Design an enzyme around this catalytic site. Structure first.
Site, PDB file in Angstrom:
ATOM      1  N   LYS A   5       0.821  -1.253   0.000  1.00 21.74           N
ATOM      2  CA  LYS A   5       0.000   0.000   0.000  1.00 21.74           C
ATOM      3  C   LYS A   5       0.846   1.291   0.000  1.00 21.74           C
ATOM      4  CE  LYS A   5      -3.640   1.930   2.956  1.00 21.74           C
ATOM      5  NZ  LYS A   5      -3.942   2.121   4.405  1.00 21.74           N
ATOM      6  N   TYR A  44     -12.583  13.624  -6.182  1.00 22.55           N
ATOM      7  CA  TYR A  44     -11.542  13.004  -7.014  1.00 22.55           C
ATOM      8  C   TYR A  44     -12.120  11.864  -7.819  1.00 22.55           C
ATOM      9  CZ  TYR A  44      -7.170  10.824  -8.502  1.00 22.55           C
ATOM     10  OH  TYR A  44      -6.203  10.266  -9.299  1.00 22.55           O
TER      11      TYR A  44
END
Lengths: 147, 147
Positions: B1, B58
């Site tokens: 991640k 976004y």
DNA sequence: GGGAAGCATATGCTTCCC
DNA sequence: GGGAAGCATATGCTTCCC
């Protein structure tokens, strides 16, 4: 030269360089003493400023902040590309150019047209890249509720 | 991640998350099958999107990109503050909030008006913060000459 | 599908040089 | 007054969580 001075994003103050630009804008805005603010206090008009170079637009943004207490400004940001020439491939919607812009929010459409005439007049007598800065009035159908 | 994945600014691709958003937008636009491009190819109108939260805006931005190859998108940026109530001082024109926005550039006013409705419709059925996203049509008086 | 992680790199800011 | 330096902290972008 360079580094941190303790001044964050949106916290810029005045200095002679920016104030000179502001005084130039003020002398131009003063050709038309039109209403700048309303009773409703709504942000229904604007001015879209782009082009020139990063520093020339930045400097214009800082000077405008000093010249007009009644406006609200965005940070500088980037513009996407337009239409590519021909039956060839177009750029994706998200692709960004190096060209910057910023937006000025105003309470009246009449003041927006005045600011726009002031910016184009102030910049037309300067050498490149400043003379290459572009501007347009923007009407917001519903207005923008600034936080 | 986390970390680098070789994709620079403006290079975002597609994934099911954004494709899912794109498909919802598409279904709404299909009821209003209007013209999205002109022959003069000028960018004369836009859709100014803001609020919600940084991620929901976004994600809406990435979905819009997939659904409309005919539009153009700026990166996300920040909004200044508005009017303070009372007789006292107002915030400086440069002060920035945590609130984000993006702009969609379009070739026709008819399609911007349709795009605005679809976005409001897409978002109004959802939970916070997504249902809090705001949209308004922007009319560029002198158009915007995208690079 | 919103939110966090986390590299690459965007601007905001200042001061210095020309 | 345009360009650059250079810290702090903005978003772009993914994968993982859930």
């Amino acid at each position: 030269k360079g580094g941190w001075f303790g001044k964050h994003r949106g916290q810029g103050g005045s200095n002679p360089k920016f104030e000179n630009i502001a005084e130039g804008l003020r002398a131009l805005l003063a050709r038309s003493h039109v209403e700048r603010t309303t009773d409703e206090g709504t942000w229904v008009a604007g001015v879209f400023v782009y082009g020139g170079s990063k520093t020339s637009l930045y400097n214009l943004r800082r000077g405008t902040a000093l010249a007009i207490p009644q406006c609200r400004l965005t940070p500088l940001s980037r513009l996407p590309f337009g239409m590519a020439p021909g039956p060839g491939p177009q750029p994706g919607p998200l692709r960004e150019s190096i060209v910057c812009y910023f937006m000025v929010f105003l309470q009246t459409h009449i003041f927006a047209e005045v600011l726009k005439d002031a910016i184009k007049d102030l910049v037309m007598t300067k050498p490149a890249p400043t003379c290459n800065i572009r501007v347009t009035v923007c009407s917001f159908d519903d207005g923008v509720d600034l936080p």
